[PDB]
Amino acid sequence: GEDENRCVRLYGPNFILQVYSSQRKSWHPVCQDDWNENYGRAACRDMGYKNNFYSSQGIVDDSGSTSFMKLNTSAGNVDIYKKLYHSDACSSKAVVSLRCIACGVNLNESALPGAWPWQVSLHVQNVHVCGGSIITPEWIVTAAHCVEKPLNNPWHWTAFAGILRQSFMFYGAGYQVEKVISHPNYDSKTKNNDIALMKLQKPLTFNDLVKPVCLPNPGMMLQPEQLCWISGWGATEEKGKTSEVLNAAKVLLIETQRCNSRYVYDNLITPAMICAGFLQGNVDSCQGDSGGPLVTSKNNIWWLIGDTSWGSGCAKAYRPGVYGNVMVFTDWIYRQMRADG
Amino acid sequence: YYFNPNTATTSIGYTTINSKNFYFNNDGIMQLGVFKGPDGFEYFAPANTHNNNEEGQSITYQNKFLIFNEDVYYFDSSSKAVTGWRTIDDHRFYFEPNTGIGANGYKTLDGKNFYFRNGLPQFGVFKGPDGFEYFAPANTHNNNEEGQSITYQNKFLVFLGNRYYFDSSSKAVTGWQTINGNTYYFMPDTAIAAAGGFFTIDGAIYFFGIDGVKQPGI
């Protein structure tokens, strides 16, 4: 009962802790009574975050559902999720909110230092090949086509964080990647499920210039056309190369029913893919921005939407770019972090 | 400029002054950078670069790299710039015998062809005197060295999302091609097979699936 009756999930933009109820086949929140920091740490560790704990507090219930996995005290030194049991309603009037890692905060054309602390550059043979996105001190998200077949040893890659100038990414100064994990479903032709995990050999030290980017929690309600941003080293000019500077471009999401139209991609886009162009063109991703982060701001937190997959003109819009859906893979990401622990 | 106190002649080339070594060009101008000394290449660094060294004085500087006006060098334990193949941190670099700079571009060597960028062989497809070639990692085919060009005939190559196709001569094709009944197009300036959306080729419109195969569309 470890692939069901022991699964916890944070929910919503407010980080509402939940526990699965096999008896009723549902996700339920947890009442705040009897709860302390220790069970918050246990719920974080179970979720693959290991020792990362940020804050837990009670928040007035807003989802509206009337049911709770109430905790026990006299059960003994047993599994934490051996205790959580159902109840009609607690008297504390508060549900638990649990943040396992501080993320999604940045300092307030080219991008200034500390504006995208979660951006990294990946160096195969001293040359910028793919970007990335920090999610924890020792895990970076990128694409599967970056690390496929010929290039798949962790000994080929190296990461640079907090440095803005490609000229300033010296040899022997990056972070060595100690493992490369590609999604098993990844299909080299359709590039479906194009996401890879690249575990660094040493943890990243977080400061004003280096910081994580939060993962998409379930139930985010992305509006039809958000206002995202795209970052990475590329070339705004076509027929270009890896830009000397890190840039950033406002991009607008595109509905999958429009992006799969026959003027755009005629069903090329699968459920695990996301489009984000910009009307009037003049802005999109580009080479060297493949494997880079697409992020948005909702409820005061920078969220990770996806990572770059492919395009057909790259600032020649009416053929916009495509990114993998981080939300869909988040459970596999959690599993991979959990097993490695 | 330095003039000999005895003969008043301007110094040229490697010169030792008050036990301090300096280099002067053919015009007698003191130079900063790397030049060949009697025992090998030496670095005449700016002032105060090491132990309050004077401007243009050779400084002890080996067992680390050197970036100077986009040029790359490396000095061994003897403070002399290294040339030829050298294994640094389990990686091989090649430096020009004449100048010692890091290698750049296609460079045939002893029957093995590479494509250097700042002295480090690169992986992938890069144009050479005959065309493009699959410069591949080590031991990818017949005990080939790291980045050495390898024989890759009549089969596709996928690399960072780039789909190349090679012919019988182990050179990547370009322009229109037909393979196993599937019509392709490969960008002439990169040999990258167009893929994934409408493309403007020869002043027309062509749609290619992300496998790269063309879509007729009439």
Numbering used by the authors:
A (entry chain B): 142 to 249, 260 to 492
B (entry chain A): 2399 to 2616
The study reports:
Hemorrhagic toxin (TcsH) is a major virulence factor produced by Paeniclostridium sordellii, which is a non-negligible threat to women undergoing childbirth or abortions. Similar to other LCTs, TcsH comprises four structural domains: an N-terminal glucosyltransferase domain (GTD), a cysteine protease domain (CPD), a combined transmembrane delivery and receptor-binding domain (DRBD), and a C-terminal combined repetitive oligopeptides (CROPs) domain. TMPRSS2 is a type II transmembrane protein that contains an extracellular domain consisting of a low-density lipoprotein receptor class A (LDLRA) domain, a scavenger receptor cysteine-rich (SRCR) domain, and a serine protease domain (SPD). Here, we show the cryo-EM structures of the TcsH-TMPRSS2 complex and uncover that TcsH binds to the serine protease domain (SPD) of TMPRSS2 through the CROP unit-VI.
Because TMPRSS2 simultaneously undergoes autoproteolysis, we introduced an R255Q mutation that prevents the self-cleavage and generated an extracellular domain fragment of TMPRSS2 namely TMPRSS2106-492/R255Q or TMPRSS2ECD. TMPRSS2ECD was used for forming the complex with TcsH at neutral pH. The cryo-EM analysis reconstituted a complex map: 3.2 Å for residues 1-2387 including the “core” domains (GTD, CPD, and DRBD) and 6.0 Å for the rest part. Notably, an extra lobe of EM density was observed at the C-terminal tip of the CROPs domain and inferred as the bound TMPRSS2ECD. The structure of the TcsH part presents a TcdA-like “closed” conformation, of which the CROPs domain curves downward alongside the DRBD domain. The CROPs domain is bridged to the DRBD domain through the CROP unit-IV, which likely forms a relatively stable configuration of the “core” domains and the CROP unit-I to IV. However, the CROP unit-V and VI along with the presumable TMPRSS2ECD were in low resolution, possibly due to the flexibility of these regions in the full-length toxin. The newly determined TcsH2236-2618-TMPRSS2ECD complex map together with the earlier 3.2 Å EM map for TcsH allows us to reconstitute the atomic model of the TcsH-TMPRSS2 complex.
